[PDB]
Design a protein around this ligand. Structure first.
Ligand SMILES: Nc1ncnc2c1ncn2[C@H]1C[C@H](O)[C@@H](CO)O1
Ligand SMILES: [Mg+2]
Ligand SMILES: [Mn+2]
Length: 510
């Protein structure tokens, strides 16, 4: 006899088969299609379970649409609810819209969300962290865990009553009890691997954000299935006898782990793989769902303004190695809103800049996170530390400036590179990290390392996101409670002539 476990992770509100780059876009992705793949495939097994492993409440323009309309997650919850999932876990982005929004979401879902390591006051935020069920005369035990690193990213007001414990420590403490109750153990961790599974070599700085390797290294023999996410990587292999899965993101793949009995009726791992999400001739989207997609596209097509010139980004890297009218524009909007000496923003992966006609679609693609902003008081020396962190983004390949391996592997982190406004500088990539920034000037004057300056950063950066630890606890001069997309919309609506001064002025070379 057998049992199959299907998992999607980091769906990120990509339900329809589109990434929204254009209205009629259609691509083999999204939860509708990924679920269709599960439904067809699962029928061959004696029984099966369906799991969402986090980062389901935020991510796509559909999520923006929901906040902007009823403020309710119900339309999204309805999709999950129809599909008859068995359980899920919490990802960090589940907190992006506040704790009440999350709590309301959990009570609207028709299956439990398991999180054993996030406490609210003196108990788990979620009703439970562990679930047990029978497979024949055996018992399966499931424990849900979430990356402890949330304080380094989220709005303080969204997590103020919460306590985040190490996933490794909570697992370590629960194992003994789980093994007393169950024969098969399944860990669903919304987090990834900090070391390469085969070599054990660190693949990122060991901050505790990701504890998957330490968990396997210490407890593999007692774990049958190790479900992971967060890093958006595609993994399906064995760690000793443990089946290890990471099913990417946006429903382009589905993780499937099959367990089957041997003589003695003992369940063992039969297979562990990623199933490709593909279109087929039986897949259909019902009328109501297509009506919702249309409303969504209609909203995305809403015209914000018409600019007198183009600010498109042809090649992302070009808009990172040197000033670009669009980065100049973003920084200028932040300087004008905040009145700080300096501002900064990352160029996000979907940021293609603006054409002359700007729609809601374009604004969201250029600022896809619900970040607010903060003006921080920092010494000129702390400012330099922040520019040196960004300068780590570059490396030299051949005799050309390129992107550092550190920011591409195991997966891309371009969003951790910032472009600054109000301060001019020179980055020398051939010099050691931490001493690459030269010629710093703020308004005709050299940056005095001992003087106090102000910088507008997003809330993610304010709590240290992307290893910008120098901003933590910097005095808050201004708390700007306007999210990025709206801040750009406001600026666009108030400055018709769009005469933008040059606030981004920097150079990158060896
Ligand atoms: N500016 C930002 N605002 C909100 N979230 C962001 C930002 N940049 C990265 N992320 C996401 C990506 C990962 O899920 C996680 C970092 O490991 O945070
Ligand atoms: Mg995540
Ligand atoms: Mn994610």
């Amino acid at each position: 006899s057998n049992i199959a476990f299907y998992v999607v992770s980091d769906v990120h509100g990509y339900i329809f088969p589109t990434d929204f780059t254009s209205r009629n876009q259609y691509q083999p992705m999204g939860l509708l299609l990924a679920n269709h793949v599960i439904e067809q495939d699962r029928r061959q097994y004696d029984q099966s379970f369906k799991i969402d492993n986090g980062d389901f409440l935020q991510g796509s323009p559909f999520c923006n649409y929901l906040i902007a309309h009823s403020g309710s997650s119900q339309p999204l919850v309805d999709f999950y609810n129809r599909m008859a999932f068995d359980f899920g876990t919490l990802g960090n982005h589940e907190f992006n819209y506040g704790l009440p929004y999350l709590k309301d979401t959990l009570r609207r879902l028709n299956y439990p969300v398991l999180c054993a390591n996030i406490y609210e006051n003196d108990s788990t935020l979620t009703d439970n962290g562990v679930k047990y069920f029978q497979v024949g005369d055996q018992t399966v035990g499931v424990i849900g865990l979430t990356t402890q690193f949330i304080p380094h990213w989220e709005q303080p007001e969204h997590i103020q009553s919460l306590t985040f414990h190490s996933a490794f420590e909570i697992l370590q403490q629960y194992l003994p009890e789980m093994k007393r109750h169950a024969d098969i153990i399944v860990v669903c961790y919304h987090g990834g691997f900090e070391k390469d599974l085969e070599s054990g070599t660190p693949t990122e700085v060991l901050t505790g954000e990701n504890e998957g390797y330490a968990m396997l290294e210490a407890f593999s023999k007692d774990i049958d299935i190790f479900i992971t996410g967060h890093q958006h990587r595609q993994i399906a292999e064995r760690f000793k006898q443990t089946a290890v899965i990471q099913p990417g993101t946006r429903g382009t793949t589905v993780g499937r782990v099959v367990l089957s009995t041997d003589e003695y009726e003992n369940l063992s791992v039969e297979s562990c793989e990623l199933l490709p999400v593909i279109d087929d001739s039986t897949f259909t989207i019902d009328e109501d769902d297509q009506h919702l997609r249309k409303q969504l596209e209609d909203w995305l097509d809403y015209e914000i303004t018409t600019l007198p010139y183009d600010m498109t980004i042809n090649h992302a890297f070009e808009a990172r190695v040197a000033p670009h009218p669009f980065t100049n524009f973003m920084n200028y909007a932040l300087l004008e809103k905040s009145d700080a000496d300096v501002a900064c923003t990352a160029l996000f992966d979907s940021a293609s800049g603006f054409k002359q006609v700007v729609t809601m679609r374009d604004v969201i693609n250029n600022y896809p996170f619900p970040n607010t902003f903060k003006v921080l008081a920092v010494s000129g020396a702390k400012l330099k530390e922040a520019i040196e962190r960004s300068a780590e983004y570059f490396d030299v390949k051949n005799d050309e400036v390129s992107v550092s391996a550190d920011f591409l592997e195991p997966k891309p982190q371009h969003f951790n590179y910032d472009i600054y406004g109000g301060v001019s500088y020179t980055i020398h990539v051939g010099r050691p990290k931490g001493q690459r920034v030269s010629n710093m000037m703020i308004q005709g004057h050299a940056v005095d390392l001992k003087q106090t300056y102000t910088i507008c950063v997003n809330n993610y950066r304010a709590v240290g996101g992307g290893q910008y630890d120098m901003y933590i606890d910097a005095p808050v001069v201004k708390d700007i409670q306007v999210e990025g997309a709206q801040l750009l919309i406001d600026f666009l609506s108030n400055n018709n002539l769009m005469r933008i001064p040059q606030v981004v002025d920097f150079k990158v070379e060896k």
